[PDB]
Amino acid sequence: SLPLNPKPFLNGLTGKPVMVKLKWGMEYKGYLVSVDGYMNMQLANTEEYIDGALSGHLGEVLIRCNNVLYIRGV
Amino acid sequence: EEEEFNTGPLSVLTQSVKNNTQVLINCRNNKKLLGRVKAFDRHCNMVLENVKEMWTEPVNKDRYISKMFLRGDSVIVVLRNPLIA
Amino acid sequence: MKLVRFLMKLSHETVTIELKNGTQVHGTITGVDVSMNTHLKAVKMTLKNREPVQLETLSIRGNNIRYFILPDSLPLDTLLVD
Amino acid sequence: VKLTAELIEQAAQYTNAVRDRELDLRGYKIPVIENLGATLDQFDAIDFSDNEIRKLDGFPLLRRLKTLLVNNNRICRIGEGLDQALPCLTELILTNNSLVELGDLDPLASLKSLTYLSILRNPVTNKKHYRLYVIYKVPQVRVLDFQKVKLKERQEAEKMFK
Amino acid sequence: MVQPINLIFRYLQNRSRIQVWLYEQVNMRIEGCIIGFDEYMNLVLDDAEEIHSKTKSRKQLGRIMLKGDNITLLQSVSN
Amino acid sequence: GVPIKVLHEAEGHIVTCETNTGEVYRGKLIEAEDNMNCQMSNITVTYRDGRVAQLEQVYIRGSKIRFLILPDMLKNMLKS
Amino acid sequence: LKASEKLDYITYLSIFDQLFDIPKERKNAEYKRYLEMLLEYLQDYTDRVKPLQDQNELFEKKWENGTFPGWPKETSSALTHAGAHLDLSAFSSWEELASLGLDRLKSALLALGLKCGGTLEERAQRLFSTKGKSLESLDTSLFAKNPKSKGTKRDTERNKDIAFLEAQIYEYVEILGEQRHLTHENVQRKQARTGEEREEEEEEQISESESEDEENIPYWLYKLHGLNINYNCEICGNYTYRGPKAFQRHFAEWRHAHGMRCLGIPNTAHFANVTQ
Amino acid sequence: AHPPELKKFMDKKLSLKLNGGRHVQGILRGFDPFMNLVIDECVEMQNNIGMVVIRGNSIIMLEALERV
Amino acid sequence: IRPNHTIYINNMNDKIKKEELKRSLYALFSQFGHVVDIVALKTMKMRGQAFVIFKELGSSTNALRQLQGFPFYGKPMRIQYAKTDSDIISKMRG
Amino acid sequence: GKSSKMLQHIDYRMRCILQDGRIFIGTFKAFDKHMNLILCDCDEFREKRVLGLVLLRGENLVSMTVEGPPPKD
RNA sequence: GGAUUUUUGGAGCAGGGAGCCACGCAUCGACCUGGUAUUGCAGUACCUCCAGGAACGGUGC
């Protein structure tokens, strides 16, 4: 696309199912409620996938920005 | 700024302080702190009440801490739930 | 709001602090500054996997703190007022 | 022209061609090796070529010294406690000196890391069995006089002198 | 002189497929086509992949935003 | 910072530097920046295994320095 | 002729490199520092300089009424440092006495006095052990058969240096009783001073310390004047001039007239305004 | 917002020690105030990777393979 | 080929590892004067060869005459004055 | 308020603990915003090593206690 | 005054077993024996090839 930046991409993905990988290898799937300037992230109906396998169903979750490796829409 | 605390991802903390509800904090130390948020800030420093700290050593362990201050860098994840209920 | 301000009020309290490197510190706060650099007296400090050592004074770089365990008595609602 | 602290302090200091820190003590007409304390153990190599030293002795404890170039001096004897002051001595170049008897080379057996040894242009060189004698008495040497110590020579030196 | 940010701007324009070296993790690297990026070197990658150097295995990701925290190094790949 | 001024004072002197990874670099400090970025020359490096090497020219980022040893020639900023 | 009492033999001998200012060449011994370290040792502040000196006075008391438990680490370390200080101070303040003689005397007293009965004997509790065990003993018999036991072997093998250092602190402090008293006095005095008093006293100690041992342009002006401003003369070597007054002086010069006259343009005052 | 003093090293061949025990070699083509680098003809220590960006964050040490 | 600060050596046993070759070369040639630097590569083109650079020119000439055909690691070395001036010499001169 | 908490210990001998767990003991002569420290006559314990005049970066500092009083010199 | 050089963290976690001695997996590197090619004037990740040897070294789990 004509330049698609970090910020708009993430904003487009609000209201959507996402999965976030953390640096530590945990993964969290849920609906992205919001993100902020520092790229802290809020998920609803979160699920946890560790070793790529469903571990725990967690609900509403804040992820501190420094933990994030990458975010994927899914 | 208050708006960003109110509606942004930190609203999780803002909501927990207002409703005096419990939250589980997954923590860098591989420990989890389960309790109520008395105060919080940008960095996710917190003043916590009725904290149940849980961890593992395999053997699970826990311990009660009535009053404590958490430096926010140690935060991995903060969870709000039907936990308080 | 700025919670370091709250910690700066805790001079002359005795606390237990857990460090990022696992070390445990019990002593009486002489001063917390804006960087959360914390200074104590009458300190019993137990590095992970040692028996305690006692120090008359100890000064901690703020960033190395994991968390403070506060006195049960502490009147938080007072201290949270500005 | 005594080898003095003052002498060492004004001496050319540089990184040599084989990437080691070397101190230049060439052509000063030094007669006796002394006062090395002042180098502060900061050199990998020390060049003592073209001087008048008689005995390879007098060194302080120098843990970093790995190369000693001692060309064109008058070395006729080697000190006995060399490994105690130079534990990692790996290369010793003694070309064109005065070692005359095979037995005078005996003190080099105590230098455990000594791997490169050069004794060319010394009278001792023409003594019968000079090469085999060095190989058996200083087995830690891998290259002697710029020639590889080979297995066959080791065995041959094991027969003679066994 | 070429400035590093500009190189990226070039990668962006070219739609060259990019391989990223991550911080303190050698066994995995990330790949994708830079669509956009920001002042923090946070990248939006398209049709992205996790590359396991040990397992010779690839994990398919699609639309990725990688935080710049992890960036050690940026290289281009012909594929 | 006061330590920074004292570092700049050591420019032109032989100094020792340990990195965050414990490699030890000794040689002449050519330039020291405000952020502790260090240009040096005619280095001896001593790795974590103990082995040494020799380098002509190096530059180390300030953040990735654990510490520096400076001459004692400087010790004699006593005001502070 | 007559300025320095020191002989050529010891011309670079300086006492100030041996004595600090607070010691006044043996008049006092500076124990404030050790009061600091001590505060660090007791992990509190209930202890004043004077109460600390009161503690030092202990040095049977230092053995049976110890400030801290004699098996405490911080304490034993402190005691070591302090002991060392007192000893060096002692020999420092009395150069003329044979140091080795004194050392050996003390060492022999240490070895010989202890062995039979701990040198410390009580009509009630019997014989005390110095440093290593810290226990009494009914009779000399059980005392002797205790000096071979695994316990005493362990202790005498671990706490030897400390015990010996303690002992030295003891005997050296005894030999310096006059200096100890002198200093304690000083402390009380300075303490009872005012501000001005304490200041003047310090002045005195200082003077005693550092006294001979034997008495007998601008830009705002060059811009105003018009100089250091870039300018060039073309006829002279495309030369540069830094001021307009100076270039106006170039018009009458040797080389400028040489360029004119040798150029074929004759000298003096018609050509003054020349550039190219 | 200072620059790193690297003009001296411009267009020279260099040896780069990176975190993770990683080492690469190449020619300095440019830099910014964060010490992010552009390195040309880069080689992973050996396989040729071409012109690359190294984030200054992960730069431990550099060594010139030339004389400056 | 006029006398030169740098000597070109060929006919060297190419089985010696590069760093060992250079260190023995340095050792051997130190007897005639300070060796400023040694250039030796193992490429197909350059294998079995080395350029030895000396501070003094008299040192280079002495080395050339005295070590012509010296057995080094088994082979007789062939020495000659280099065709061109060494980069290091040119920089040290101007 | 006072800023003294560091300035008090200045000139004193100080025991400093590093992030890897080393012990640096030297004379505390200067500090700054980052807690970069200047340590005179400094030794390292883990194995005692004499270092001398040391500048330590604050990033890698954990903590400090008073080890002994100032040397008079 | 939490976004690369310091203070809001890339950290976290994993070693005993067998009879003083010895050790799983993956990647890279010289490296050591034989034999074999190459005779070439340069500024260097590294450097012939063929067969055999590794009770070699470094990093990660």
Residue C37 maps to which CATH number? 2.30.30.100
How big is the CA angle at H14 (ends H13 and H16), to the nearest 5 degrees? 155
How far A58 CA sits from the closest chain E CA (Å)?
A: 23
Chains E and H touch (3+ CB pairs under 8 A): yes
Q: Provide the shortest C-alpha distance from residue D27 to chain F (in Å).
A: 24
What CA–CA distance (Å, rounded) separates E39 from E22? 18
CB distance E20 to E8 below 8 Å? no
Residue with smallest Cα–C1' gap to K4:
H57
Which residue matches tokens 């006061």? Answer: F2
Cα gap D18→I40, rounded to integer Å? 12
Tokens of B74: 């140690």
Tell the residue number behind the tokens 């180390």, with chain if given. F60
The residue type found at C37 is N
End-to-end CA distance of chain J: 31
Closest CA to J16 of J71, J68, J61, J70: J61
CA dihedral of residues B15, B17, B20, B22 (deg, nearest 10): 70
Taking each helix axis as running N to C, give the angle between helix D130-137 and helix D151-159, from 0 to 180 degrees, rounded to the nearest 10.
Answer: 90
Q: Are C63 and B74 in contact (CB under 8 A)?
A: no
Count H helices and E strands in chain A, helices first. 1, 5
Q: What are F73's two structure tokens? A: 């020639």
Whether the beta carbon of F4 falls within 7 A of nucleic chain K: the reply is: yes
How far is the first Cα of chain E from the last one, in angstroms, to the nearest whole number?
28
B 12-31 residues, CB < 7 A, strand K: 28-30
**Helix %, strand %, coil % for chain J, to 5?**
10, 55, 35
Shortest CB distance from E35 goes to which of A4, A23, A66? A4
Question: For chain I, what is the radius of gyration of the CA atoms?
Answer: 12
User: Which residues does G117 contact at the CB level (< 8 Å), separation at least 6?
Assistant: G127, G140, G143
Contact I89/I60 with Cβ under 8 angstroms?
no
Q: Give the residues across from F31 on adjacent strands.
A: F39
User: How would you classify the pairing of strands D45-47 and D21-24?
Assistant: parallel
Structure tokens at J66: 């008073």
Phi/psi for F79 (5° steps) reads -55, -45
The amino acid at residue D108 is L
Residue type, G262: C
Instruction: Compute the distance between CA of residue F42 and CA of residue F58 in angstroms, rounded to an integer.
Output: 8
Q: Which chain H residues in 11-30 lie under 8 Å from chain E, judged by CB atoms? A: 18-22, 24, 29-30
Chain center to CA of I89: 14
CA atoms within 13 A on the CB side of J4: 4
Q: Nearest Cα to E40, choosing from D158, A65, G62, F7? A: A65
Query: Cβ neighbours of residue D83 under 8 Å, at least 6 residues apart?
Result: D89, D110, D111, D112
Q: Calculate ∠ Cα G23-G28-G29, nearest 5°.
A: 70
Chain mean position to CA D91: 7
CB proximity J36–strand K (7 Å threshold): yes
Round to whole Å and give the CA distance between H34 and G273: 56
CATH number (2.40.30.10, 1.10.10.10, 3.40.50.2300, 2.30.30.100) of H7-64 reads 2.30.30.100
Among residues G169, G163, G164, G165, the alpha carbon closest in space to that of G59 is found at: G169
Residue found under tokens 């040095």: G59
Domain that holds residue C61: 1-82
- Find the length of chain B: 85
Instruction: Report which residue is nearest nucleotide K27 when distances run from CA to C1'.
Output: E54
Fold of I1-94: Alpha-Beta Plaits (3.30.70)
For residues I72 and D101, what is the distance between their CA atoms, to the nearest angstrom?
25
Q: How far apart are alpha carbons B47 and B16 in whole angstroms?
A: 12
Place of tokens 């106006």: G248
D10 CB-near residues (< 8 Å, 6+ apart): none
Sign of CA dihedral G195, G198, G200, G203: negative
A73: nearest CB among E12, E63, E69: E63
Which of D103, D94, D113 has the alpha carbon at shortest distance from D137?
D103
Data resolution in angstroms? 5.7
Distance in angstroms (rounded) separating the CA atoms of residues E50 and D38: 57
Q: Do E74 and H55 touch (CB under 8 A)?
A: yes
What residues make up the domain containing B60?
1-85
> Chain K bases under 7 Å from protein CB?
1-13, 26, 30-34, 36-48, 57-60
Could you tell me if E30 and E50 are in contact, meaning their C-beta atoms sit under 8 angstroms apart? yes
- Nearest chain H residue to F20 by CA: give it: H60
Helix-, strand-, coil-residue percentages of chain E, each rounded to 5: 20, 60, 25
d(CA G266, CA G270) in angstroms, rounded, equals 9
- CA atoms of E61 and E51, how far apart (whole Å): 11
Window I44-73, strand K contacts by Cβ < 7 Å? 44-49, 51, 53
- C43 φ, ψ (degrees, to nearest 5): -105, 125
Of J33, J52, J60, the CB nearest to F1: J33
Cβ-defined contact of J59 to F63 (cutoff 8 Å): yes
CA–CA–CA angle H50, H51, H57 (5° rounding): 120
* Cβ-defined contact of I35 to D95 (cutoff 8 Å): no
Q: How far off is chain F from J41, nearest CA to CA, in Å?
A: 9
* Cα atoms in the 13 Å half-sphere on the side-chain side of J36: 22
Longest dimension (CA), chain F: 42
What are the structure tokens assigned to G156, written together?
A: 């005498």
Interatomic distance E56 CA / K26 C1' (Å): 12
DSSP reduced 3-state for E55: coil
d(CA B43, CA B40): 8
Q: Does B12 touch chain A (CB under 8 A)?
A: yes
The answer to whether F54 contacts D14, with C-beta atoms less than 8 Å apart, is no
- Asked whether strand K has any atom less than 7 Å from the CB of E67, the reply is yes
Q: Are C68 and C17 in contact (CB under 8 A)?
A: yes
Name the burial class of residue I28, with classes exposed (0-12), middle (13-18) and buried (19+) by CB atoms within 10 angstroms of its CB.
buried
Residues listed for chain J: 73
Report CB contact under 8 Å: E8, H55.
no
Mutation target vs J (from C35, C43, C59; most J CBs, 10 A cutoff)? C59
Determine the straight-line distance between the first and last CA of chain F, rounded to whole angstroms.
11
> Taking Cα atoms as reference points, which of D77, D25, D76 lies closest to residue D51?
D25
Please state which of the four CATH numbers 3.40.50.2300, 1.10.150.130, 2.30.30.100, 3.40.50.920 is assigned to the domain occupying A2-74: 2.30.30.100
3-class DSSP string for chain F: CHHHHHHHHCCCCEEEEEECCCCEEEEEEEEECCCCCEEEEEEEEECCCCCEEEEEEEEECHHHEEEEEECCCCCCCCCC
A51 beta carbon to strand K: under 7 Å: no
Assigned fold of E3-77: SH3 type barrels. (2.30.30)
Distance, in Å, from the CA atom of E14 to the CA atom of E8, rounded to the nearest integer, reads 10
Any strand K atom closer than 7 Å to A45 CB? no
**Any strand K atom closer than 7 Å to C1 CB:** no
Cα–Cα distance for residue pair H13/H22, rounded to 1 Å: 17
**Topology (CATH) of F1-80:** SH3 type barrels. (2.30.30)
Q: What are phi and psi of C36, to 5 degrees?
A: 60, 15
Which of E30, E38, E43 is closest, CB to CB, to A7? E38
CB distance G190 to G204 below 8 Å: no
Domains of chain D, residue spans: 1-162
Nucleotide closest to B42 measured between CA and C1': K2
Chains J and G touch (3+ CB pairs under 8 A): yes
Of F12, A5, H12, nearest in space to E1 by CA: H12
Q: HSE-up of J69 (CA within 13 Å, CB side)?
A: 17
Asked if C15 and C29 count as a contact pair (C-beta separation under 8 A), the reply is yes
Q: Which residues of E touch A65 (CB under 8 A)?
A: 67
Cβ atoms G124, G138 nearer than 8 A: no
Q: Which residues of D touch F73 (CB under 8 A)?
A: none
**Residue J9 touches partner C, C-beta closer than 8 Å:** yes
The β-bridge partners of E37 are E43
Distance CA J16, CA J22 (A): 8
**Closest residue, chain D, to F42 (C-alpha):** D15
Our CA-based measurement puts residue F61 at a distance from the nearest CA of chain D, in whole angstroms, of 23
Measured CA to CA in angstroms, residue J11 lies from D132, F68, F76, F77, J71 at distances of 64, 20, 13, 12, 8
Distance between start and end Cα atoms, chain A: 19
- CA–C1' nearest nucleotide, residue E38: K3
Per-domain boundaries in chain A: 2-74
What residue has its CA nearest to the C1' of K57?
A: F49
Distance F16 CA to K14 C1' (A): 35
| Rounded to 5°, angle at Cα B32 from B26 and B35 | 100
β-pair partners for F45 = F25, F53
Size of chain G, expressed as the number of residues it contains? 276
Cα(A67)–Cα(B26) distance, integer angstroms: 12
H65 Cβ contact partners less than 8 Å away, ≥ 6 residues apart: H12, H13, H14, H15, H25
Domain residue spans in chain J?
A: 1-73
- Yes or no: say if D39 and D60 are a contact pair by the CB < 8 Å rule: no
User: Which chain A residue's Cα is nearest to E48?
Assistant: A72
> CATH code at B66?
2.30.30.100
CA of C33: nearest nucleotide by C1' is: K7
**What is the dotted CATH code of the domain comprising D1-162?**
3.80.10.10
| Termini Cα distance of chain G | 73
Residues 6+ apart with CB under 8 A from J5: C30, C31, C33, C37, C39, C59
J59 touches strand K (CB under 7 A): yes
Beta-carbon count within 10 A of F60 CB? 24
Neighbours of C60 (CB within 10 A): 25
I38 strand K contact, CB < 7 Å: yes
Q: Where are the domains of chain F?
A: 1-80
Judging contacts by C-beta atoms under 8 Å, the chain G residues touching residue C58 are: none
Q: How far apart are CA G64 and CA G122, in angstroms?
A: 12
I84 touches strand K (CB under 7 A): yes
Closest CB to F1: pick one of J36, J40, J59: J36
CB-defined contacts A:B, below 8 A: 60
Q: Is the CB of B44 under 7 A from strand K?
A: yes
Using left for φ > 0, alpha for ψ between -120 and 50, and beta otherwise, residue B11 falls in: alpha
Phi-psi region of I69 (alpha: psi -120 to 50; beta: other; left: phi over 0): left
Query: DSSP character for G129?
Result: P
| Amino acid type, B51 | V
* Interchain CB contact of J69 with G (< 8 Å): yes
Pairing assessment for the beta strands G231-232 and H37-44 based on DSSP bridges: unpaired
User: Which 37-66 positions of E have CB less than 7 A from strand K?
Assistant: 40-42, 54
CB contact under 8 A, D21 and F42: yes
Cα separations (Å) of F2 from D116, F33, I78? Answer: 49, 14, 61
Asked whether A34 and E33 are in contact (CB, 8 A), the reply is no
Continuous H helices in chain G: 32-42, 49-57, 61-64, 73-93, 99-117, 140-144, 150-158, 160-175, 177-191, 195-209, 219-225, 244-250, 254-263
CB F3 within 8 A of CB J37: yes
Cβ atoms < 10 Å from Cβ of G91: 14
